[PDB]
Amino acid sequence: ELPEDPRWELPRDRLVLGKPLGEGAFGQVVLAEAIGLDKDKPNRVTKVAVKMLKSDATEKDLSDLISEMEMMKMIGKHKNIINLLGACTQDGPLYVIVEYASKGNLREYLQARRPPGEEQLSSKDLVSCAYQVARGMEYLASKKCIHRDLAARNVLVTEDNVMKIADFGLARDIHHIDYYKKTTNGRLPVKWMAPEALFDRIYTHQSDVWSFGVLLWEIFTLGGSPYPGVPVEELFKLLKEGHRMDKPSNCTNELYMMMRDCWHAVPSQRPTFKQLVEDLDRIVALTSNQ
Numbered sequence: 001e002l003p004e005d006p007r008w009e010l011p012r013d014r015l016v017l018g019k020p021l022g023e024g025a026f027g028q029v030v031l032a033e034a035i036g037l038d039k040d041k042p043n044r045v046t047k048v049a050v051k052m053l054k055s056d057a058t059e060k061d062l063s064d065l066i067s068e069m070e071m072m073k074m075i076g077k078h079k080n081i082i083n084l085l086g087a088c089t090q091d092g093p094l095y096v097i098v099e100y101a102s103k104g105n106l107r108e109y110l111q112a113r114r115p116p117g118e119e120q121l122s123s124k125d126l127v128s129c130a131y132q133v134a135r136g137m138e139y140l141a142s143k144k145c146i147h148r149d150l151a152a153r154n155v156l157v158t159e160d161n162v163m164k165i166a167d168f169g170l171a172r173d174i175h176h177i178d179y180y181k182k183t184t185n186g187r188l189p190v191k192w193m194a195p196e197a198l199f200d201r202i203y204t205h206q207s208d209v210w211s212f213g214v215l216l217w218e219i220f221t222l223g224g225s226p227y228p229g230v231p232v233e234e235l236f237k238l239l240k241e242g243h244r245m246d247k248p249s250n251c252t253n254e255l256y257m258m259m260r261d262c263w264h265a266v267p268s269q270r271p272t273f274k275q276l277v278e279d280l281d282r283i284v285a286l287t288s289n290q
């Protein structure tokens with residue numbers, strides 16, 4: 001059984017479970033409606049996302065879920081991250097309630113708004129999106145949190161087009177990861193990892209800045225796939241040689257200098273998220289919406 005925490009505990013009959021949002025091998029997430037989430041307003045419903053364990057689940061699976069929830073509690077609230085909203089831990093299965101992003105992940109979001117060959121994105125929108133992710137990371141970095149898998153897939157979009165970093169409190173042991181394991185879409189995660197993290201198993205804020213650069217590339221290609229057709233072994237050889245991706249079309253020289261700056265071979269020489277936030281702020285201001 002779990003110890004109760006009156007800070008986040010919500011009654012089970014106050015949560016109306018709905019349709020599934022997706023599964024995996026660890027757990028599953030479902031859409032739901034929560035009544036009286038806020039103490040002040042107990043007669044209004046709020047759409048939320050609920051994470052739970054699956055059927056044949058180990059004690060390790062359960063321990064990881066608890067860890068994720070605990071990390072979120074300590075980290076605190078921020079507009080550009082998926083925030084914790086409550087939990088059902090007593091007399092039943094564990095339910096972790098978080099904010100709901102109705103427009104899916106950033107990759108999907110971008111791909112659906114590409115030009116034809118329903119909604120479109122201006123240059124300012126793209127830069128604004130980048131600015132939001134940098135702010136989220138800046139906050140997370142301030143609370144000593146290292147993401148380890150920052151990518152477009154792990155960034156969700158709300159109904160009012162707000163970017164929110166997801167899966168940041170995840171518990172994933174180093175040296176147990178499969179480099180050859182692919183994603184649901186068919187991409188390899190090793191393609192977002194800084195060289196030092198990929199070869200020497202060293203994760204830091206600076207390694208997350210490297211992944212942010214690949215994320216910038218994903219934004220300006222509207223959801224492109226990095227290193228398409230490149231297997232793991234050839235990826236290693238490209239990184240050892242200093243290879244860097246080419247500048248996407250309809251990207252300014254200034255934004256492609258930023259990407260390169262994030263991909264600096266020496267980790268101390270890349271910009272911090274505090275700096276990235278400042279630069280993107282000035283760029284958003286000067287970028288056309290026409």
Ligand SMILES: *S(=O)(=O)c1cc(C(=O)OC[C@H]2O[C@@H](n3cnc4c(N)ncnc43)[C@H](O)[C@@H]2O)ccc1CC
Pocket residue numbers: 021022023024025026027028029049082098099100101102104105156166167170
């Ligand atoms: S878990 O730790 O196994 C886990 C599971 C999932 C997952 O099943 O993802 C499936 C789909 O659900 C979407 N999704 C997750 N969280 C949200 C929120 N808050 N709003 C909307 N949609 C959400 C995913 O984007 C995916 O399509 C994901 C992550 C974990 C943690 C490692």
